[PDB]
Amino acid sequence: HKSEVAHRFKDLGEENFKALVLIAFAQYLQQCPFEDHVKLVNEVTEFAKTCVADESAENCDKSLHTLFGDKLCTVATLRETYGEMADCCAKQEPERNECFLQHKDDNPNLPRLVRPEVDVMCTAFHDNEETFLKKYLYEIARRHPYFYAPELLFFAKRYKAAFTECCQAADKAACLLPKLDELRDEGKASSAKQRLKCASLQKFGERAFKAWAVARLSQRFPKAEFAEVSKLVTDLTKVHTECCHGDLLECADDRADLAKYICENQDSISSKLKECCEKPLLEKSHCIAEVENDEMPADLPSLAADFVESKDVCKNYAEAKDVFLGMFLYEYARRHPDYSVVLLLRLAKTYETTLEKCCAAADPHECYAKVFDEFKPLVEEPQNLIKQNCELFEQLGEYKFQNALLVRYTKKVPQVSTPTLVEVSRNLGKVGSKCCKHPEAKRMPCAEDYLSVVLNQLCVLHEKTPVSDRVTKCCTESLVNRRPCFSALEVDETYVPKEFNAETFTFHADICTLSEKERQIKKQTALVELVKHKPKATKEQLKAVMDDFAAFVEKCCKADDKETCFAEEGKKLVAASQAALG
Ligand SMILES: CCCCCCCCCCCCCC(=O)O
Ligand SMILES: CCCCCCCCCCCCCC(=O)O
Ligand SMILES: CCCCCCCCCCCCCC(=O)O
Questions:
Q1: Considering the domain 118-191 in this protein, what is its CATH number?
Q2: Cα separation, 344 vs 378, whole angstroms
Q3: 386 C-alpha vs ligand 2 centroid, how far in Å?
Q4: Nearest CA to ligand 2 atom 5
Q5: Are 506 and 570 in contact (CB under 8 A)?
Q6: Does domain 502-581 match CATH 1.10.246.10?
């Protein structure tokens, strides 16, 4: 094209253009204030329009990288605020843009973002929607500089819908706060999932990434032929490699190209792609990535004939081992959309280990005749963990399920900090809540995705502040072994009970009318401290103390003099509990 800035402006339309430009500058210049960025965005937008009017006017024929970089090099506080990043300006393209990318900051040391009160939020949203929404977009972008700009834009539109719905409601806070909860968690997850894929590509390498993609794409597109899946695996891997190592525009072009190839070849790939493929360029790759699994073909045969029974198994394998294993993973995965991806990779690894043994043995065919039997323990372990945890979740409800996990995990790794124990147990409880309301066939994939983000959060915290060799092992294992390493953790027989501290077990009158979350967290914090203090306490003894706690809170929140109730009845409860637990 004559003018890439005009091309993009036309493809995107003014409103998306401006939003994306704001995210771009915020991701590179994480410390500049909102108003400074609004001025850069307006100036870039004004310039873009001249190019749309006449693609031969001044500067309109420069690359986007050239234009973007030039604008960055005009910021007056560049050296003052970003130091060595100003020296990127002494370079030509493409080294200049390379240099700018090296200076982004994953952990920007910015203050926690405060959710204002619901009435303040709705008022700001009514009084100036544009500013309200753009400011939050800016705040999120500068805190997540690698997050894919278009997906950020997809969340922003969901925020807008939530304020539109809930600000005109009768009970604004009870409408909105659950929606904002849901969206913040989905956004945190998406951000963690992206970081995780990039780390894992570097740690475990490209072959392992392709294995993962074969499994994932085959579940999603089970009517596609292996040759088409293999094609998509190769293109997907290239896309991910660039998006991990790359600037926004290179990632965007790679994603747009794959989406277009997919949309042109729907008939070969999936029947569920028509809606997505109608959508505007901006949303297409995203929509595709989130499409539901196609229906698998009817009356597919058993894998036995090709992978066990044939005389030619070792020959077909040795001819090209990764193609054969890829084929095994394709056939297995498309027949089992109810499996986690990591389970399918365990099976593939098991199959490979068996062929490596058996193809060099005296009688290969006899040696690998029972390989499918080796799959059964692998499959049953996650299915049985889901049933047990979902049965417990149905008995207790979310909050008491969380409390069960708090007790469980605190005894297993009592050296972890209380906030971390509380946060991770709370999150695991929310994985239960989400995934146990799916039917059996959808639980294992759901669990896999969401556990992967909770366990990632834990491993991130633990790397920064190590306390347990056992957690370190789980965190540095292969991605396929990570969750079973955590499930295999046992009770810590070596922990020395924390000393009693009375202030830890004191509570105040405000407990009564505080937010549902805030009340829960205060109770769960004390539950963890109780288990840390009394790690040998039995289930019946903890139930008794927990029951007494609940009678104590019920009494004191109905009293007229609440501060004295909490202090006087609080001391009694503590002394009774200490006697019972010994
Ligand atoms: C205590 C958390 C409750 C979440 C629901 C239970 C999940 C059990 C593990 C599922 C297996 C994840 C995928 C895998 O490792 O194959
Ligand atoms: C503090 C570490 C938390 C570990 C979370 C593992 C996720 C799966 C939870 C299912 C219950 C534990 C599995 C088991 O012990 O068999
Ligand atoms: C030995 C000192 C123990 C003091 C007793 C405090 C116990 C913590 C209460 C845990 C919350 C229970 C859950 C609930 O009923 O909401």
A1: 1.10.246.10
A2: 9
A3: 11
A4: 486
A5: yes
A6: yes
